[PDB]
Symmetry: C3
Subunit: 159 residues, 3 copies
């Protein structure tokens, strides 16, 4: 069951749903806009033959940050990990789903391939999986609206 | 909370949910099948170096229609915009989610990458984001079943 | 409306939701983890020019099964069909959604592109659409946790399951 703007505001204004930093202009009919943080992980594929989910591979990615005033350029076929600017804190009876923005959706931008489901009790910056399936580069600006977060009510609180 | 066929029928036959043209055989257990319109947008990437979400890029895409009776050929790696043949009209207490059809899913077709979340209050033809992640071209026939739309009930009407 | 762990347990322990084989440690706060079965279909694209959804195309896929103890290696840009090791049986008041696991999501793994919505009344092994959008190959181990399944309550039981 999808929380409406009024219900999202009720949950926030009562501290059961944590959103830091909070911006009320971001609340939509039945969701809230999220923004792009400025740290990214790229994959170092010249040292590894392959990914093995059963193993640990601590050189698999590196942390990056665009120079001030520069964009992060996402080329078609490149896969990179980013984060929501906001820090989220969910209670025991709400789950989250990321959805794309219609705006950026028509531009070929994917934000959560891969994984956009957020467990109740979650707390942290939401991981974004960024992809471009268009046939040009897209310039990403730290701070921009990147997608939207829906809250789903559970039939009852989690054990 | 997901509307059943019975409840979808109720909403439709009461005019609260607009679907034109409607076809009863399209109703599924907890969703409604949608069909492919015949107009497509392709990207004109020979005149632009890149997409910039923050600008107006005016001839980025172009209208494309195949010959009546010809398939739109969609090759792996191409990204194209299309629409549902049906015109949708949502009330203020329901939201929509596009989902793939199991049939076309197994053939490598993606229809809403990108963006498949439809706000309550929406009215129009639903935009499709078309992609082919298989290893062969897929022939698209306008009028064919392309996917399905679910209705989610909101916790309360939106502002 | 999303079933919690406690409601998923009630549905299962009363037989209205079938999961075979069932393992209680896989239950998550509002979903259940699913596992990778060992048969895969790959596409034989040297015999056809194209896929046509309106025709029947029988020699379209081929059966690949990894030797035991070894993995199915999934290269970027390849598309393969797999299956949940579990058998699911849904009653007609519940629908299912596949979602990715956070851990595999950060490795570039797609499990249900394409199609992750399960109708009420469904019964069978759930089809997985496998893709790798990373820039390395990923080794898949049959039996591994591959994703999760959420249950949605319907506003009322379905008429035409």
């Amino acid at each position: 069951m999808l929380l409406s703007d009024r219900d999202l505001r009720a949950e926030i204004s009562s501290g059961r749903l944590g959103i830091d930093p909070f911006d009320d202009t971001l609340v939509q009919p039945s969701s809230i806009d999220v923004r792009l943080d400025c740290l990214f992980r790229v994959f170092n594929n010249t040292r590894y033959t392959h990914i093995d989910p059963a193993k640990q591979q601590d050189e698999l990615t590196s942390l990056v940050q665009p120079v001030d005033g520069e964009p992060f350029v996402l080329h078609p076929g490149e896969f990179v990990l980013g984060s929501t600017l906001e820090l989220f804190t969910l209670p025991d009876n709400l789950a989250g789903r990321l959805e794309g923005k219609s705006s950026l959706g028509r531009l070929g931008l994917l934000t959560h391939s891969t994984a956009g489901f957020i467990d109740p009790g979650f707390s942290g910056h939401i991981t974004l999986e960024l992809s471009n399936v268009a046939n040009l580069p897209i310039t990403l600006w730290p701070g921009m609206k990147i997608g939207q977060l829906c809250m789903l009510r559970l039939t009852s609180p989690s054990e």
